Amino acid sequence: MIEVVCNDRLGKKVRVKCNTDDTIGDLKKLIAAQTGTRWNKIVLKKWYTIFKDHVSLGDYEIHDGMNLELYYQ
Template identity: 50%
Template sequence: MDQDISDSKDSKKSRESKDSKNSNDTMIMVTCNDRLGKKVQVKCSPTDSVLEFKKLLAAHIGTPYNKIKLRYGGINSLNNKLTLDDYSISNGVNLELYYT
């Protein structure tokens, strides 16, 4: 009987953990503008790193991810190791896209 109660508690904790993870993985839409008239919208997660975002963007535009430079909010070049959330990039944000 004690084993059943323990299993039930573990199962509840597992469900709660999955639910909280799903709520943190809300998808956002970010627009990138290359200032030459090309705008691309990319669906991503706020927890994606800048590098992961560049790879998604590269797949959309057909440019190698290592040739992409992103600017936002006066920051000249976003750090690949930080997340979009670290830069407060949220749904509907516009990033400046440059090619190196």
Template identity: 60%
Template sequence: MIQVQVNDRLGKKIKVKCLPTDTIEDLKKVLSLQIGTSFDKLVLKKGHQIYKDHITLEDYEVHDGFNFELYYV
């Protein structure tokens, strides 16, 4: 189990526990329950990299304490 942090750049920081085998879409679904926005309207980025829904966290080498930037579409 790893814990990642998501910053929406509007002052909201959310910590989410997930498994390394979870996909980005799974992470977005958990986030959508916590913030009340549909998961398909969320985009996770880090720098200029946009994370694709069908790829797992371990494939992206996401580790415990990783920080995502959250954008709304």
């Protein structure tokens, strides 16, 4: 099972353990559970490649260690 690094250069270098064939809504739930912010407010980017709340995780094909620039809505 996959380990993801919800990272940022503003005091948030978070390591969430995401599921293999899981969605991103649950990934945002985990990012909130480990980061301390409301669920619907979180945003994930990689140079404006805004990952959405319905596109799956294996769709983009994230793998172990793929860090993601964290931002807030």
